[PDB]
A paper describes a structure:
Here we describe a new mechanism by which foot-and-mouth disease virus (FMDV) can become resistant to ribavirin. Amino acid changes in the viral polymerase, selected by ribavirin, are able to modify the types of mutations produced in the presence of ribavirin. P44S but not P169S was detected in a 70% proportion in R-Ap35, as evidenced by analysis of both the consensus sequences and their corresponding mutant spectra. These results suggest that the three substitutions in 3D were selected sequentially during replication in the presence of increasing concentrations of R: first M296I, then P44S and finally P169S. To identify possible structural modifications of the viral polymerase associated with the important alterations of the mutational spectrum in progeny RNA, and to investigate how these modifications can affect RNA binding and polymerase activity, the different mutant 3Ds were incubated with the heteropolymeric sym/sub-U RNA of sequence 5′GCAUGGGCCC3′, crystallized, and analyzed by X-ray diffraction.
In contrast, 3D(SSI) crystallized in the trigonal P3221 space group with the sym/sub-U RNA incorporated in the structure. The X-ray structures were determined to 2.2 Å and 2.6 Å resolution for 3D(P44S) and 3D(P169S), respectively, and to 2.6 Å and 2.5 Å for 3D(P44S, M296I) and 3D(SSI), respectively. The analysis of the electron density showed also the presence of the duplex portion of the template-primer RNA in the central channel of the polymerase of the trigonal 3D(P44S, M296I) and 3D(SSI) crystals. The 3D(P44S, M296I)-RNA and 3D(SSI)-RNA structures are almost identical (rmsd of the superimposition of all polymerase residues of 0.22Å). However, the crystal structures of 3D(P44S, M296I) and 3D(SSI) in complex with the RNA template-primer reveal a rearrangement in the template channel with important effects in template binding, in particular, at position n+1 (nucleotide A3). The conformational changes in the main and side chains of residues M16 and R17 allow the opening of a hydrophobic pocket formed by residues of motifs G and F and by M16 that facilitates the entrance of nucleotide A3. In 3D(P44S, M296I)-RNA and 3D(SSI)-RNA complexes the re-oriented residue R17 points to the polymerase interior, interacting with the side chain of residues N41 (which lies in the same loop of the substituted amino acid S44), and with Y285. Nucleotide A3 appears also reoriented, flipped-out towards a pocket formed by amino acids M16, P117, G118, Q160, F162, V181 and V183. Interestingly, the incorporation of RMP opposite C was 3-fold lower for 3D(SSI) than for 3D(M296I), but no such difference was observed when the incorporation of RMP was measured opposite U.
Residue numbers in the entry: 1 to 476
Write the structure that this text describes.
RNA sequence: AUGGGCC
RNA sequence: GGCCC
C-alpha cells in the first residue's frame, strides 16, 4: 500500500533477531542454495551497504486509485463472484459465539492458545492465555472490554511487525528480502472469527474450482480432484503476482467487503466493518510507527480467504475489461491466496491482461520460465500450485503432488533444535511422491541417526487416502 | 516470530 | 511440531 506517515516513538517494540533454524546433517550433503532469512542488520551474509529496515518496507509502493468506471465494473465482478459463492455455501452466516470462535467448528480449527497476542499486550508482557481461557472458551475483562468497543465500531489497534524466521533462497537472503508478519491483537482475530467464522468454515468444506478456492484442501487427496478437472481444458496458466498482499488497493478491498459480506447474505453488520479496519493500518516496528493505506495484513484471521476471494474477482475483472460477454463459466480457476491456476478453452491472452491487472495495482507475470510472455497450450502437468507439481502416479493412475527435489533438500537441510525427528516424518509425507529412488536419496544423510518411514508404508497410506476403493482393488 | 489450511 | 500460503 501507501506509507502516509512515519513517526518515531519512545516505546520500542522488539523484533526477534537471530534465527531458530539450525543446519542439519543433510546441509553438508546437499549444500542448498538456501538459508535462514536475515533477521539482523548486522548479519554478515547481507550485501554491503544494504539496510534491512529499508528493504522490508519497499513492497509498499503506493495505493492504486480506481476510476468510477473501474469501480463500477469491480462492483459488478465482486457481486457476481459473491452470488456464486453464497449460492454454493448457503447463507447461514450468523455470528459465531465466543466459545465457537475460540474452539472452532467443523471446517474451522481452534485458535492457537500459545501464539503471539499482538499489541498493546506485547508491551505489557502478556501471553495469550492471560487474556483468553482456551480450555473452556471464555475471555477475560481485557478482551471483553475490547469486544464491546468493536460492537460500537470504535475499536482502534496497531499491528505488531515481526520478521519471518524462515528458509529463503540465498539470493533473497543476500538482498535482505525478509518477509514480514503483521501480528494483529488477539481480540481482533477473535472478533473477525465471530463475524465470518461460519463463512470461512463453509469455504474450507466446499473447496474446489466451483468457488475457485483451495483453502481447506489436502493436496495428498485433492490433487486427483483438481488435476482431472484442469486436464479437461485446452489452456492452463500459471500466473504469478508480486507483493500480492501489499498491492491490494483500498478501492478494491472496500468494494469486495461491501459486496461479499452484505447483511442480505446473513452476515452481522459488523462483518463488513471489522474487515474494513484492515484497509488503513498502523504498524509498530521497533521505535517506529508506520501508517499504511491499502494492502492486507498477514496476521488477520481470514487473510488467505480474503486474498483468495480478491484473486477470483481480479481475474473476472481483468477479462471483462478486455473482452465482451465474459462470465464465470468463460473460464475456471483455483486459488490459495496469491497462488493461482487459471484454465479455459478460449484462447485467452493474459499478456494483454497485464495493464488491466495494473489498474488494480497488481503485476502479473508467467511462472512458466521467464518465457517473455504468457503462451497457450500448456496443460496442468506443466504448472505449479502450492509448491507442488501435478504428476501421474505410475501404480494407481492418480494425480500426486510432487515437490521439486531442490526444495525438499532445502527443507531437510534446516530445523529447529530437537525437532528434526518430528520434521523428518512430516517431510516424508511430502517426499513419498518423488518416487522410491529420490525418497531414498533425500533421507540418505539421515540413516542410522533418526527413524525414517519406509517408502512402502507411506505409499500405501497415500493410496488409501486418495481413494479408499483403489487400496481395496489391489486386494481383490 | 503469525493468520489460515492440511499432516 | 512440520509444511503450504
Amino acid at each position: 500500500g501507501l506509507i502516509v506517515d512515519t513517526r518515531d516513538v519512545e516505546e520500542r517494540v522488539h523484533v526477534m533477531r537471530k534465527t531458530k533454524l539450525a543446519p542439519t546433517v543433510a546441509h553438508g550433503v546437499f549444500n542448498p542454495e538456501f538459508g535462514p532469512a536475515a533477521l539482523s542488520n548486522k548479519d554478515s551474509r547481507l550485501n554491503e551497504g544494504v539496510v534491512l529496515d529499508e528493504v522490508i518496507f519497499s513492497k509498499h509502493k503506493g495505493d492504486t486509485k480506481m476510476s468510477a468506471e473501474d469501480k463500477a465494473l469491480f462492483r459488478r465482478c465482486a457481486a457476481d463472484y459473491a452470488s456464486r459463492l453464497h449460492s454454493v455455501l448457503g447463507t447461514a452466516n450468523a455470528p459465531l459465539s465466543i466459545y465457537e470462535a475460540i474452539k472452532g467448528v467443523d471446517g474451522l480449527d481452534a485458535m492457537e492458545p500459545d501464539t503471539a497476542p499482538g499489541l498493546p499486550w506485547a508491551l505489557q508482557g502478556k501471553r495469550r492465555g492471560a487474556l483468553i481461557d482456551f480450555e473452556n472458551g471464555t475471555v477475560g475483562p481485557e478482551v471483553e472490554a475490547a469486544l464491546k468497543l468493536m460492537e460500537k465500531r470504535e475499536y482502534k489497534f496497531a499491528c505488531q511487525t515481526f520478521l519471518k524466521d524462515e528458509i529463503r533462497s540465498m539470493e533473497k537472503v543476500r538482498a535482505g528480502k525478509t518477509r514480514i508478519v503483521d501480528v494483529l491483537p488477539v481480540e481482533h482475530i477473535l472478533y473477525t472469527r465471530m463475524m465470518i467464522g461460519r463463512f470461512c468454515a463453509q469455504m474450507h468444506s466446499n473447496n474446489g474450482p466451483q468457488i475457485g478456492s483451495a483453502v481447506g484442501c489436502n493436496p495428498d487427496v485433492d490433487w486427483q480432484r483438481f488435476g482431472t478437472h484442469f486436464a479437461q481444458y485446452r489452456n492452463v496458466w500459471d500466473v504469478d503476482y508480486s507483493a500480492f498482499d501489499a498491492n491490494h488497493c483500498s478501492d478494491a478491498m472496500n468494494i469486495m467487503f461491501e459486496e461479499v459480506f452484505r447483511t442480505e447474505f446473513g452476515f452481522h453488520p459488523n462483518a463488513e466493518w471489522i474487515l474494513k479496519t484492515l484497509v488503513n493500518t498502523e504498524h509498530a516496528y521497533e521505535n517506529k510507527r508506520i501508517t499504511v493505506e491499502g494492502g492486507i495484513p498477514s496476521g488477520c484471521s481470514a487473510t488467505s480467504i480474503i486474498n483468495t476471494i480478491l484473486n477470483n474477482i481480479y481475474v473476472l475483472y481483468a477479462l471483462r475489461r478486455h473482452y465482451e460477454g465474459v462470465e464465470l463459466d468463460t473460464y475456471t480457476m483455483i486459488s490459495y491466496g496469491d497462488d493461482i491456476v487459471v484454465a479455459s478453452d478460449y484462447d485467452l491472452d493474459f499478456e494483454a491482461l497485464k495493464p488491466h491487472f495494473k489498474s488494480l495495482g497488481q503485476t502479473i507475470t508467467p511462472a512458466d520460465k521467464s518465457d517473455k510472455g504468457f503462451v497457450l497450450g500448456h496443460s496442468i502437468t506443466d504448472v505449479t500450485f502450492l509448491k507442488r507439481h501435478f504428476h501421474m502416479d505410475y501404480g494407481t493412475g492418480f494425480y500426486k503432488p510432487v515437490m521439486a527435489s531442490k526444495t525438499l533438500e532445502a527443507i531437510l537441510s534446516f530445523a529447529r533444535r530437537g525437532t528434526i525427528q518430528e520434521k523428518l516424518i512430516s517431510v516424508a509425507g511430502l517426499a513419498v511422491h518423488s518416487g522410491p529412488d529420490e525418497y531414498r536419496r533425500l533421507f540418505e544423510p539421515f540413516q542410522g541417526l533418526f527413524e525414517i518411514p519406509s517408502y512402502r508404508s507411506l505409499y500405501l497410506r497415500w493410496v488409501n487416502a486418495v481413494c479408499g476403493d483403489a487400496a481395496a482393488l489391489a486386494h481383490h
